[PDB]
Design a protein around this ligand. Structure first.
Ligand code: COA
Ligand code: U2J
Length: 153
């Protein structure tokens, strides 16, 4: 009630804004296929607005691996000047809400570069655990290692 944060749908009209946000926020590039897939996942991809200004986004996919139905968060981020305003929480809660309303997901997971202490803190607050550390997950950036964070459902 009175929230300055709103999530909106990703469409062909604003996908360029999502691509721009990811470019600035993330140290790795996402190919044309990632953005094409994003347009087809429905509610699993959203843009976050702060006072109607696009400041972050979340892109997820359904994953069928380890004989499970898993939600894979590919990207979840917010521009640096708008951090610690609850934008990340609003995006994570949106995806946790989808998972709860669907009821067929075993878990939710993502990769977090080991140097991202603030992202590890953020996800651990939501009940995500470090279940593994993947050596050389990244190819062109340092550290190349990524923790796998998972929340069971
Ligand atoms: C991780 C990220 C998404 C968090 O989003 P955010 O909008 O700042 O998060 P919120 O304001 O909702 O923070 C929620 C809680 O997480 C914890 N947390 C977040 N950032 C933290 C930090 N820098 N230090 C300590 N705790 C932190 C806090 O408990 C915080 O609650 P509080 O602000 O009431 O103390 C954001 O820092 C970001 O955009 N980073 C780059 C993207 C990224 O690295 N994600 C990789 C995985 S896809
Ligand atoms: C079926 N799968 C798909 O469709 C699909 C599409 S993208 C994807 C996943 C999502 C994953 N997201 C994270 O790593 C997040 C966000 C972030 O940017 N960082 C740093 C972080 O901490 N966590 C990256 N990614 C890779 O595969 C990936 C991407 C880039 C590089 C690389 N290496 N050197 N240059 N580029 C290595 C791996 N999967």
């Amino acid at each position: 009630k009175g929230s300055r944060i709103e999530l909106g749908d990703v469409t062909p009209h604003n996908i360029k804004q999502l691509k721009r946000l990811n470019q600035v926020i993330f140290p790795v590039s996402y190919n044309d296929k990632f953005y094409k897939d994003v347009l087809e996942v429905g509610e699993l991809a959203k843009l976050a607005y702060f006072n109607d200004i696009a400041v972050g986004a979340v892109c997820c996919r359904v994953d069928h691996s380890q004989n499970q139905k898993r939600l894979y968060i590919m990207t979840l981020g917010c521009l640096a000047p708008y951090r610690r305003l609850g934008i990340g929480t609003k995006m994570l809660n949106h995806v946790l809400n989808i998972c709860e309303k669907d009821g067929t997901f075993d878990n939710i997971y993502l990769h977090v570069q080991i140097s991202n202490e603030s992202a590890i803190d953020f996800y651990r607050k939501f009940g995500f655990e470090i279940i593994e550390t993947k050596k050389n997950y990244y190819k062109r950036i340092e550290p190349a290692d990524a923790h796998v964070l998972q929340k069971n459902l």
